């Protein structure tokens, strides 16, 4: 939504961490036990850094790549650098901020007008979508693997990202 | 040029005979006020074709029925639409070239930058009317917009260029 400012010195070290696998940026806006070890399993087995904005009890299976905060500057993580991927809920605004900074996202529609803003932008070629109640590790896991890495994703959203800069 | 999203593309459609005009003046608007977005919702109010405005603020008081609101918009795709009839833009220079490429005339409303110079650059052929984003009234840029989607000469000047 705006120029990336520099992270705090904690998650610029976290995310320098990633090396050439870089790092994906995870918020959906309590689920159940269940659903979020499901999510913490798929996001253990990749080789990226994640960071996950998360509130709820710390999942079992989270990985060591894995941290959880209870707030992230979003914009800025998106605009870093180092940043494959996003997964998200949907809300408009961060779907803007993923355009803007040309970041292909994982969509986990949940409500109200989600639904309709990941349709669009996986017609778009820009996402892959999930659901969230029925969705497995490996579902997971699946879709995470397509967006960081077939250049595609990358590709078609950068179509509407530089459409937004000049 | 791809397909439009379903809730735009009806309002796309329902311009009819209208056509509809594309307004965007960038990612970086520090200068868009209340008062600004006021004089240019109540001038795009008054012209018969639909309006696709990207804007990211309090919506205006004197928005048009004819007006809606974006936070984005798939730009490219929407010059590129058989009813677009005008491109009201800051003067980008990718967005000019996205113009010329589908042979849409432009209203220019410069901020800063190369802008000034791209309107300008678009004027010398005739495919362009300017407007002062600062002193402007509402009826200045109506007065522009009238010019640009209604006289036929700079549709066909900004074709010469396509």
Same mark, same amino acid.
């Given at each position: 939504s705006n120029a990336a400012k520099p992270l705090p010195k904690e998650m610029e070290d976290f995310v320098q961490s990633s090396g050439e696998n870089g790092v994906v940026v995870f918020s959906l806006g309590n689920m159940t036990e269940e659903r979020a070890n499901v999510i913490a399993s798929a996001l253990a087995q990749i080789p990226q850094k994640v960071l996950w904005r998360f509130d709820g009890n +710390? #999942?079992?299976?989270? &990985? /060591? @790549?894995?941290? /959880?905060? +209870?707030?992230? #500057?979003? @914009?800025? /993580? /998106? &605009?870093? #650098? +180092?940043?494959?991927?996003? %997964?998200?809920? &949907? &809300?408009? @605004?961060? %779907?803007?901020?993923?355009?803007?900074?040309?970041i292909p996202m994982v969509g986990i529609p949940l409500f109200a007008d989600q639904p309709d803003n990941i349709a669009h932008m996986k017609a778009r070629g820009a996402a892959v979508r999930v659901d969230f109640n029925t969705m497995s590790s490996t579902d997971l896991l699946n879709a995470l693997k397509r967006v960081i890495n077939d250049p595609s994703y990358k590709e078609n959203v950068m179509k509407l990202s530089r459409i937004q800069h000049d």
């Amino acid at each position: 939504s705006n120029a990336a400012k520099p992270l705090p010195k904690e998650m610029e070290d976290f995310v320098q961490s990633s090396g050439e696998n870089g790092v994906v940026v995870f918020s959906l806006g309590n689920m159940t036990e269940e659903r979020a070890n499901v999510i913490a399993s798929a996001l253990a087995q990749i080789p990226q850094k994640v960071l996950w904005r998360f509130d709820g009890n +710390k #999942p079992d299976t989270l &990985g /060591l @790549n894995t941290r /959880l905060y +209870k707030w992230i #500057p979003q @914009n800025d /993580l /998106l &605009g870093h #650098p +180092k940043t494959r991927a996003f %997964i998200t809920h &949907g &809300g408009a @605004n961060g %779907i803007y901020e993923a355009i803007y900074h040309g970041i292909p996202m994982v969509g986990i529609p949940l409500f109200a007008d989600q639904p309709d803003n990941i349709a669009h932008m996986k017609a778009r070629g820009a996402a892959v979508r999930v659901d969230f109640n029925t969705m497995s590790s490996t579902d997971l896991l699946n879709a995470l693997k397509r967006v960081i890495n077939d250049p595609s994703y990358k590709e078609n959203v950068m179509k509407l990202s530089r459409i937004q800069h000049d």
